[PDB]
Amino acid sequence: SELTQDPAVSVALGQTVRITCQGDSLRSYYASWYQQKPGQAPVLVIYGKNNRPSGIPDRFSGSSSGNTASLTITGAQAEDEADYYCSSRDKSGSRLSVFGGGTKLTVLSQPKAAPSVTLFPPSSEELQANKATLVCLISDFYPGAVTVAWKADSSPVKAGVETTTPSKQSNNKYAASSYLSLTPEQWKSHRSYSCQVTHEGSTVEKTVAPTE
Amino acid sequence: EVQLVESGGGLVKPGGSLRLSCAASGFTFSNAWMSWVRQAPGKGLEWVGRIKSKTDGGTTDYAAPVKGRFTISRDDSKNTLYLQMNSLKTEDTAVYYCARTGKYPGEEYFQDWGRGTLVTVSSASTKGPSVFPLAPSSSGGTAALGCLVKDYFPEPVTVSWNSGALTSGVHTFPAVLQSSGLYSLSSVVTVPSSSLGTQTYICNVNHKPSNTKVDKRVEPK
């Protein structure tokens, strides 16, 4: 990922928010910016430097400094809630294009809520099928953005991990799921496994052990 | 008034081939650069490649993961852009977007985007789910329990609890497509810990494609 963005930011109605993109190619080129709402295709918001297409209001503006590019929204409105992506060349002189990882912008419409986390060890029945899945379920959080990290014996592990993007609950908060697939032998060979969930800069941990 | 409409997405096996089309109007097609961009379910945008206008040489450039496997071409007489996808891989599963591409060295930007068409790559055929309990045991007054629905194909699976009588606190998550080309999902419910000895909790898993229904009673360890 030659272009890097923060995964998530939030803003209150009427306030100003800045989303930043970083990469070596931004020293040579402007970044363009794209807005994508759930279930819709992207739309261009800024191109060149601070060119807003027709239909894009003035409150969106672009700027750049060194190897960074920034999208600023002044006076955030509910309709500005979306994922935002930057794009530019991957390096100077290249004929290729790349995107940043995207930033989820939440326009705050309900209280910030910390996730409830439950980590399920592999069921005995699944082990009988010669498989082992740790299931980390994450619910009731807002804004709908988390990062999930797994540990085995207190050290990081991220092979065999699959994580769903947060989606809405019936009560309008967010939930997400993460899976760590192991062999039965891997599962019974370690002392502990942990699911670490970071939300709004705070991290909670749940741990399970192949004993007890 | 600019219109871009992608078509041709479908289910295809690894190693197979698939041809996407993007039909365009509302701009002078022959003078436009045109790109493809893709997005795996729940993930970010990834540039696929771009073809220049005839006046600018008509040449193509490709992202490293697809170079040598996909071909971008255009038929200006039909206002149509194509993506010929060969040697398909499971990691190519994504919505594929067509984008009119502006230019001004200088970078390129994506002026207009289509709706997208979905490409799913898997070697699997119809396969019913295996259902495993996510059992509660020793969050305060409440406990979470659920059902893990593993390795089915194709989508969808639906899940209810107690034949629909239980809805409060229920959440069924989106499915994950694994490298195996099979899907898995989970469903969870949060209930009062004191009900675990009073109320029975059964997840009802329906997989219409395989003519399968599974009921799993979930009990504490």
Author numbering:
A (entry chain L): 2 to 9, 11 to 95, 95A, 95B, 95C, 96 to 106, 106A, 107 to 210
B (entry chain H): 1 to 52, 52A, 52B, 52C, 53 to 82, 82A, 82B, 82C, ...
Task: List sentences quoted exactly from the publication behind this structure.
One such antibody, the 10E8 antibody from donor N152, is perhaps the broadest of all HIV-1 antibodies thus far identified. The 10E8 antibody recognizes an epitope in the membrane-proximal external region (MPER) of the HIV-1 gp41 transmembrane glycoprotein. Like other MPER-directed antibodies, the 10E8 antibody is able to recognize its gp41 epitope in the membrane context, a trait that it appears to acquire during maturation, as this trait is not present in V gene-reverted germline versions of these antibodies. Here we combined an additional round of NGS from the same January 2011 time point with structure-function studies of germline and mature 10E8 antibodies and of their maturation intermediates to approximate the developmental pathway for the 10E8 lineage.
X-ray diffraction data from these three structures extended to 3.05, 1.70, and 1.60 Å respectively, and they were solved by molecular replacement and refined to Rwork/Rfree of 18.8/21.5, 23.7/27.1, and 19.4/20.9% for ligand-free mature H and L, gHv/gLv, and gHv/mature L versions of 10E8, respectively. By contrast, the structure of the gHv/gLv Fab showed substantial changes in both the heavy chain 2nd and 3rd CDRs (CDR H2 and H3). All four residues at the top of the gHv/gLv CDR H2 differed in Cα-positions by over 1 Å from the mature unbound structure, and much of the CDR H3 was disordered. Thus maturation from germline to mature 10E8 affects the structure of the CDR H2 and H3 regions, and these structural changes occur primarily as a result of somatic hypermutation of the heavy chain V gene. Reversion of the 29 and 18 mutations in the heavy and light V-gene regions, respectively, abolished neutralization (10E8 gHv/gLv), whereas retaining only the eight SHM-derived mutations in the CDR H2 retained neutralization for seven of eight diverse HIV-1 strains (10E8 8H).
